[PDB]
Design an enzyme around this catalytic site. Structure first.
Site, short mmCIF file in Angstrom:
data_model
loop_
_atom_site.label_atom_id
_atom_site.label_comp_id
_atom_site.label_asym_id
_atom_site.label_seq_id
_atom_site.Cartn_x
_atom_site.Cartn_y
_atom_site.Cartn_z
N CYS A 137 0.76 -1.35 -0.07
CA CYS A 137 0.02 0.05 0.02
C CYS A 137 0.99 1.31 -0.15
CB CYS A 137 -0.90 0.04 1.23
SG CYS A 137 -2.01 -1.41 1.50
N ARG A 181 -5.12 6.19 -2.41
CA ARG A 181 -4.08 5.08 -2.18
C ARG A 181 -3.89 3.82 -3.09
NH1 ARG A 181 -6.43 1.75 1.71
NH2 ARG A 181 -4.53 0.53 2.14
N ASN A 221 -1.44 -1.44 5.38
CA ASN A 221 -0.74 -2.64 5.88
C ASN A 221 0.43 -2.45 6.97
OD1 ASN A 221 -2.84 -4.37 4.37
ND2 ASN A 221 -1.31 -4.47 2.83
#
Ligand SMILES: [Mg+2]
Ligand SMILES: [Mg+2]
Ligand SMILES: [Mg+2]
Ligand SMILES: [Mg+2]
Lengths: 317, 316
Positions: free
Chosen positions: B1, B17, B80
């Protein structure tokens, strides 16, 4: 510019490129039919043997292709090469004299395989014969591919060079021999997730994926894009459907694309990936997107008069 | 990410994102309206004060957001963070106990600015309270932004830390302070074009653009993506239209995206950018594309009842 060639394992060709430039290129999808009356300065293109589709412009009723593929599974892309491209100043008796602007048209309209092109290249001289006063000869080198393999063509100060492109990629300067040797500077780059590594007495585990990819450069410099494209393209798993292979082209080329602000030219304007084009022999279709819109557009050769007599500047997609 | 926050100089927020994963995440666009009856395990979300839109899943009639923004110009993305995220094992009496799965909902549904959430975070304990047996608490850290600025929230073995994210980006491990210090290892990276450099007596001219950008790493490692995103995001020229700012999000995140084959996880499966999402406060719209289709899709909050009483999972 960065270009790639690959196949699906079933005889289908995919050849795709980024066009990197500081402003709008004016590109259009151009279809060259088999009945079109050619305008070849030295007779290298006496007639259209295979219909051609690709991105380019038309000047003097002549298709000036940036990249294109034909109806027999062969494709070619011309990538920027100034400072190294140096064409002959005059045609040579007995040679296959190809004007620089018509070289991709010559490749795609005349031959059906890399074997055929490579043999024909034995007598080729590429001549600085501009299409007109508005467009001097673009300084380029070319990647040519079919479903089997790719070659690179570079015409420089000491003449014609043809390379086996065993990494199936091409960028810009310097010459292909330099880039190929440069690959040997990245022998420890790998997608693998390592087993735990003990350095002295330190137990080192990866933060996550990509720990052995370290060293692959991310800058926009042409040697760096060559290495980065070569890595991504070599490790991309082969796909067997049209949809996955189209997705493979745009993802691979997004890995080496250029976006606003990150690298300027001497003018101060930023070089950007203005379009990304892909030719698919499986569907005889040209796909592309642009800096302004990532949605993939397509033009199928079957939708146009590929046996007609006039160049078709496609408006509908 | 990898995530980014930026504005258009007119008070409009953009937060976007990449979601990087080895398989299909099952994500959907979820609208949480102000009339929805909450299911907050420790009462941190007693009601929806601002309608929320973003990417996530629904379980037990609860929106589990991966990223989202609200009707007041505040947005948040959970990225994450395994190996570094460590939540409290139990709620703490007297604290604002936020279940890990509801933290982005808590941010977006309660507050209207980074100032507000930053003040409220002083009493927050994030608790490992899974939504159900099927979904353990995702191990994450968050970027939160409004049109003014971004902060990063990391809940680790040392508790809650809030960082001033003055580079407006976030990636994965390790912690934000490490990444921020790491930026000082790339001080000679520049978009500038040098006309000529004399090395000893050699006249060195660039092959082309990007000669001073050398050193920016191109690998998928989380610290490398942080540096690469920080550079691209910092140098992207500010834009004033919705169209150009949408384009800025997807181009910037494509620069740090992951594609098939290039970096494997421990399982041997390759990590890929499964989707890229963007929240725009100017149009109250969530935009996205996927690994399978780069065309940008969008859901406008105005097309749904932002004051309705039910979660809306958008299709088509
Ligand atoms: Mg254009
Ligand atoms: Mg001859
Ligand atoms: Mg998906
Ligand atoms: Mg250049």
């Amino acid at each position: 510019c960065t270009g790639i060639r690959y196949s699906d394992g079933s005889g289908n060709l995919y050849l795709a490129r980024n066009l990197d430039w500081t402003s709008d290129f004016g590109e259009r999808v151009v279809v060259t039919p088999t009945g079109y009356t050619t305008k070849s300065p030295f007779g290298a293109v006496p007639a259209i043997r295979h219909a051609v589709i690709g991105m380019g412009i038309v000047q003097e009723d002549t298709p000036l292709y940036f990249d294109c593929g034909n109806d027999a599974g062969l494709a070619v892309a011309g990538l920027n090469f100034p400072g190294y491209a140096q064409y002959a100043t005059e045609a040579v008796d007995g040679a296959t004299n190809v004007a620089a602007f018509e070289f991709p048209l010559w490749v795609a309209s005349q031959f059906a395989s890399v074997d055929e092109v490579e043999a024909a290249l034995a007598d080729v001289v590429i001549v600085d014969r501009p299409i007109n006063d508005k467009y001097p000869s673009s300084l380029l080198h070319w990647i040519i591919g079919d479903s089997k393999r790719a070659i690179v063509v570079e015409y420089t100060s000491d003449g014609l060079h043809v390379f086996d492109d065993d990494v199936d990629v091409l960028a810009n300067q310097p010459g292909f021999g330099w880039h190929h040797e440069n690959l040997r500077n990245y022998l420890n780059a790998s997608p693998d997730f390592p087993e735990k590594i003990v350095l002295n007495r330190a137990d080192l585990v990866p933060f996550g994926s990509g720990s052995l990819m370290r060293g692959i450069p991310g800058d926009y410099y042409s040697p760096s894009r060559f290495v980065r494209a070569a890595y991504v393209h070599a490790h991309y798993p082969g796909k067997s459907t049209e949809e996955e292979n189209v997705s493979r082209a745009f993802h691979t080329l997004q890995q080496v694309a250029m976006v606003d602000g990150s690298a300027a030219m001497g003018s101060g304007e930023f070089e950007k990936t203005t379009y990304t084009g892909l030719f698919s022999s499986r569907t005889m279709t040209y796909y592309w997107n642009t800096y302004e819109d990532p949605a993939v557009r397509s033009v199928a050769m079957a939708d146009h008069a590929a046996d007609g007599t006039e160049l078709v500047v496609v408006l509908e997609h």
